[PDB]
Amino acid sequence: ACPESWIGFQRKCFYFSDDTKNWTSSQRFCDSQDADLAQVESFQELNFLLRYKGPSDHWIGLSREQGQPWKWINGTEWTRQFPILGAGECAYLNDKGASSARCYTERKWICSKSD
Amino acid sequence: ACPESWIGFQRKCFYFSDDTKNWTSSQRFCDSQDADLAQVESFQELNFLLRYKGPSDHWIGLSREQGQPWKWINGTEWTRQFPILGAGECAYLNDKGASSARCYTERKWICSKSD
Numbered sequence: 001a002c003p004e005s006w007i008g009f010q011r012k013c014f015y016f017s018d019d020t021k022n023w024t025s026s027q028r029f030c031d032s033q034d035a036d037l038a039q040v041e042s043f044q045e046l047n048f049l050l051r052y053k054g055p056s057d058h059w060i061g062l063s064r065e066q067g068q069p070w071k072w073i074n075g076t077e078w079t080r081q082f083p084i085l086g087a088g089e090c091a092y093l094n095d096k097g098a099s100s101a102r103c104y105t106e107r108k109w110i111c112s113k114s115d
Numbered sequence: 116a117c118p119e120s121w122i123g124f125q126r127k128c129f130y131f132s133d134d135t136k137n138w139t140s141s142q143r144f145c146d147s148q149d150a151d152l153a154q155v156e157s158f159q160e161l162n163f164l165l166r167y168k169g170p171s172d173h174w175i176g177l178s179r180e181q182g183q184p185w186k187w188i189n190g191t192e193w194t195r196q197f198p199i200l201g202a203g204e205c206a207y208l209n210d211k212g213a214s215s216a217r218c219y220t221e222r223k224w225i226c227s228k229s230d
């Protein structure tokens with residue numbers, strides 16, 4: 001199904017990182033591994049990632065310009081199921097839900113791809 | 116790979132329970148679902164379960180009579196990679212590692228099976 005060390009949920013594979021990068025640097029790596037910063041499509045993909053990820057904040061793959069809709073990796077509009085709190089431009093997961101911060105700060109990250 | 120709500124690791128599927136049973140009652144359920152109380156074979160299967168399981172203690176599928184070796188579901192000897200602490204007869208996972216307690220106390224549980 002999924003590579004060693006990668007974890008699978010709902011016909012899917014996610015990497016949780018050991019180190020801390022800024023948001024774009026984290027994108028490049030995920031990509032380098034044929035993958036993307038988690039796209040958090042499902043409400044359960046959220047919960048799963050919250051449960052597995054641990055106490056550190058982790059970048060996920062939503063961003064936005066100041067006024068704008070959260071947009072996925074590719075550039076599309078995010079179907080706004082759950083909140084994304086804060087006033088950042090980069091979306092991250094905290095302990096309990098999704099939130100936002102400046103993209104240049106460093107944070108562990110999660111990678112999404114397929115089986 | 117694995118049923119809805121079940122999570123996969125290392126060519127494997129695990130259920131994490133929502134409720135609290137005693138050890139044997141937890142065995143019966145896992146079985147009812149063509150599964151066993153996690154057998155914790157790997158050192159990474161440990162870490163994975165610790166990371167996913169959450170703050171509640173969870174029964175896993177090792178037991179022993181008083182003096183004896185930890186024995187799997189079937190009845191065999193457990194290859195003693197990691198500690199199992201305490202003086203219980205039923206093995207459980209706490210926050211940080213494996214431990215042991217009386218089998219009749221109630222605890223969430225984890226189920227192991229295959230893909």
Ligand SMILES: *[C@@H]1O[C@H](CO)[C@@H](O)[C@H](O)[C@H]1NC(C)=O
Pocket residue numbers: 022024025104
């Ligand atoms: C992210 O950090 C890298 C260091 O690996 C650095 O080259 C770069 O300045 C940062 N990227 C952005 C967009 O600030």
Ligand SMILES: *[C@@H]1O[C@H](CO)[C@@H](O)[C@H](O)[C@H]1NC(C)=O
Pocket residue numbers: 137139140219
């Ligand atoms: C476990 O609990 C069940 C209640 O579901 C009960 O029937 C039984 O007394 C308990 N089993 C053991 C081995 O104590």
